[PDB]
């Protein structure tokens, strides 16, 4: 029906599960969907840890993003997800606050947000298209009241999907890999120069090379797995723009 009617970019998905039942459920949704970039919401460090724990346990590339974390971890975590070096990034409302994301593949909500606005704001800001703008809140039907008003104010309906019996969780493998270089602006890192360092000093191609996050302290450069393990290996004994720096491939 509405499908042909230019379906809405912001989809509202709801799943009934427990604080623990969400662990196996979330991963499953990522194994069956295989999203290029999924941002899981967490209320506290606990949830963020529990999620990443289960994911890493099976072999799912995940990463945590907090607001009280160190700049390094923040940039290293933001680049790992933005560059596509990871699969699931568990961040908080304060951590993923208007961050650098405008093409999220899916936004998983560990639990109903604080307000009906933020909830839609998260997915609404992260994306605003059909392919994107996916929001999946994991929580028992007890909080249905929150989704009832949230869906009403949005003039839309929610697809309360129930969890399956068994579980065929899979392992999501990264497609890229960021490189935490210790060059930064100090090493004269410009939006394009770093490219020559990898596509000139290392021997990588533009197809493998990804995004590059430059900073006044350090610089990050993405690289396809095809040349990820190599980029870091080469740089180890090389240098960018004639400057000996330290690289670190974000797993």
Curated annotation (Swiss-Prot):
The GO cellular component terms are: cytosol
Q: Which reaction does it catalyse?
A: ATP + H2O = ADP + phosphate + H(+)
Q: Which domain of life is it from?
A: Bacteria
Enzyme nomenclature, EC number: 3.6.4.13
From the Swiss-Prot or TrEMBL record, state where the protein is found. Cytoplasm
Which keywords does this chain's UniProt record carry?
Answer: ATP-binding, Cytoplasm, Helicase, Hydrolase, Nucleotide-binding, Ribosome biogenesis, RNA-binding
This protein's record includes keyword Transferase: no
Q: Which GO terms describe its molecular function?
A: 3'-5' RNA helicase activity; ADP binding; ATP binding; ATP hydrolysis activity; DNA/RNA helicase activity; RNA helicase activity; rRNA binding
Ways its activity is controlled: Requires hairpin 92 of 23S rRNA for optimal activity. ATPase activity is stimulated by interaction of the N-terminal domain with RNA.
Name the enzyme's class: hydrolase
Annotated region (Involved in 23S rRNA binding) at 177-251
Domain comment, as recorded: Contains an N-terminal domain that binds non-specifically to RNA and a C-terminal domain that binds specifically and tightly to hairpin 92 of 23S rRNA.
Q: What does this protein do?
A: DEAD-box RNA helicase involved in the assembly of the 50S ribosomal subunit. Has an RNA-dependent ATPase activity, which is specific for 23S rRNA, and a 3' to 5' RNA helicase activity that uses the energy of ATP hydrolysis to destabilize and unwind short rRNA duplexes. Requires a single-stranded RNA loading site on the 3' side of the substrate helix.
Name the family the entry cites: Belongs to the DEAD box helicase family. DbpA subfamily.
Q: How does it assemble?
A: Monomer.
Q: What is this protein called?
A: ATP-dependent RNA helicase DbpA
Name the gene behind this protein: dbpA
Within the intact protein, the region shown is: 209 to 457 of 457
């Amino acid at each position: 029906g509405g499908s042909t009617d230019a379906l809405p970019p912001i989809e509202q998905q709801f799943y009934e599960t427990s604080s623990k039942g969400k662990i196996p459920l979330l991963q499953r949704l990522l194994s069956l969907h295989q999203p290029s970039s999924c941002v899981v919401f967490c209320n506290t460090k606990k949830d963020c840890q529990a999620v990443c724990d289960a994911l890493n346990e099976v072999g799912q590339s995940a990463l945590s993003l907090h607001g009280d974390l160190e700049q390094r971890d923040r940039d290293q975590t933001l680049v790992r997800f933005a560059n596509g070096s990871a699969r699931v990034l568990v961040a908080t409302d304060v951590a993923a606050r208007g961050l650098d994301i405008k093409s999220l593949e899916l936004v998983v909500n560990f639990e109903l947000a604080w307000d009906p606005e933020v909830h839609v704001h998260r997915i609404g800001r992260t994306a605003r298209a059909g392919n994107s703008g996916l929001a999946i809140s994991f929580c028992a039907p007890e909080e249905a009241q929150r989704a009832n008003i949230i869906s009403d104010m949005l003039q839309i309906k929610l697809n309360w999907q129930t969890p399956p019996a068994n579980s065929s969780i899979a392992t999501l493998e990264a497609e890229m890999a960021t490189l935490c270089i210790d060059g930064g602006k100090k090493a004269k890192m410009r939006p394009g120069d770093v490219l020559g360092a990898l596509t000139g000093d290392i021997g990588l191609d533009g197809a493998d090379i990804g995004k590059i996050a430059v900073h006044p302290a350090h610089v990050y450069v993405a690289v396809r797995q095809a040349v990820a393990h190599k980029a870091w290996k080469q740089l180890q004994g090389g240098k960018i723009k004639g400057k000996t720096c330290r690289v670190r491939l974000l797993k």
